[PDB]
Enzyme design. Structure first.
Site: not given
Ligand SMILES: Nc1ccc(OCc2cn([C@@H]3CNC[C@H]3O)nn2)cc1
Ligand SMILES: Nc1ccc(OCc2cn([C@@H]3CNC[C@H]3O)nn2)cc1
Length: 330
Positions: A35, A199
């Site tokens: 990640d 970008s």
């Molecule tokens: N739809 C959406 C997508 C991203 C977001 O925020 C970034 C984010 C990214 N992640 C990873 C996936 N779960 C644990 C992390 O590795 N978690 N939050 C908020 C809303």
């Protein structure tokens, strides 16, 4: 030194990618989600509340002769998507693809949120953002990459994610056979702890390229491509019948559609995401409405170049004193 490990989609939609990681002595192999949007290496463990474990492989530090409890250290992470986890901390030996770090902080989960429990294929996360984001308290810990950096042949790692297929994470070297053309490097801001870059614009399908600065993060831990509402509307307007659905939570489109490509700029270079990479399949089993892989970032607060974008490229995370990001077509 170098390391090289295959990363494999967890399902037929490429919802996430898992990479095997050896922890402890004798090795305990866990499949972790690498990640670049976070900075904690955390695992399901012998310490995780039993009702919150559903099929994951666990790390048991008491069975590792190299594990040592990091006295008084705890961690707690609240991800942008609302998921969370927390627990205690060990140091132990961790190896990825032949690259070994001794004394790596391995954050053992005592609690995880329901989304983690419900995903039996992901045994934890390996954070590859900057160590300033690490949540261990009262003594912040370094990421696996930061610990390995000085030993690596070059202070870099690369992400080569596959479309509906395995791909590769390499540490310490650039595989010049893994991409076409040249790698275009672009500036990174580390001020928020992310691989944040700008970008140079976008195109939809065979359309003209729009030169416009789009700040965002390169995030292997986010499945989709989240961009400003104007950009996303311009994309989906080229798909007959596509619409933003408040009930579903984003743009959906008729599963019968053939999707156009989406191009993003890296300097003067262009990375083309094929239309099929943007199809995330039926919104529920048997539905003819399909979920889009390009979505608005309006509710998030940052644009995210997640797997949909990154899997169209060979991506260099250059951790030199002044970090940069490289993108090549492949
Ligand atoms: N739809 C959406 C997508 C991203 C977001 O925020 C970034 C984010 C990214 N992640 C990873 C996936 N779960 C644990 C992390 O590795 N978690 N939050 C908020 C809303
Ligand atoms: N680490 C790593 C990652 C990916 C990888 O190969 C994926 C791949 C598969 N295929 C064809 C599919 N059916 C016939 C195959 O030849 N081509 N490339 C090899 C090593």
């Amino acid at each position: 030194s170098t390391g090289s490990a295959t990363t494999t989609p967890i399902d037929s939609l490429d919802d996430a990618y898992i990479t095997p990681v050896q922890i402890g002595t004798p090795a305990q192999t866990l499949n972790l989600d690498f990640d670049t949007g976070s900075s904690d290496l955390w695992v399901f463990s012998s310490e995780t509340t039993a009702s919150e474990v559903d099929g994951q492989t666990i790390y048991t530090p008491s069975k590792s002769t190299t594990a040592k409890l990091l006295s008084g250290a705890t961690w707690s992470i609240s991800y942008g998507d609302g998921s969370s986890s927390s627990g205690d901390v060990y140091t132990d030996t961790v190896s990825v693809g032949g690259l070994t770090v001794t004394g790596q902080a391995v954050e053992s989960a005592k609690k995880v949120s329901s989304s983690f429990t419900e995903d039996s294929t992901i045994d934890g996360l390996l954070g590859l953002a900057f160590s300033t984001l690490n949540t261990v308290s009262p003594t912040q810990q370094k990421t696996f990459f930061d610990n390995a950096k000085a030993s690596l042949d070059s202070p870099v790692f690369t992400a080569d994610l596959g479309y509906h297929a395995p791909g590769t994470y390499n540490f310490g070297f650039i595989d010049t056979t893994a991409y076409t053309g040249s790698i275009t490097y672009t500036a990174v801001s580390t001020k928020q702890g992310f691989w944040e870059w700008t970008s140079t614009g976008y195109a939809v399908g065979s359309g003209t390229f729009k030169s416009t600065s789009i700040d965002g993060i390169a995030d292997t831990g986010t499945t989709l491509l989240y961009l400003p509402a104007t950009v996303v509307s311009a994309y989906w307007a080229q798909v007959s019948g596509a619409k933003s659905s408040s009930s579903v939570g984003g743009y959906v489109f008729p599963c019968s559609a053939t999707l156009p490509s989406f191009t993003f700029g890296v300097g003067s270079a262009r990375i083309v995401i094929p239309g099929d990479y943007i199809d995330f399949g039926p919104i529920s089993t048997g539905s003819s409405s399909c979920f889009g892989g390009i979505q608005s970032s309006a509710g998030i607060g940052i644009n995210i170049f997640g797997d949909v974008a990154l899997k169209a490229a060979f991506v260099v995370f250059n951790g030199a004193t002044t970090p940069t990001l490289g993108f090549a077509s492949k």
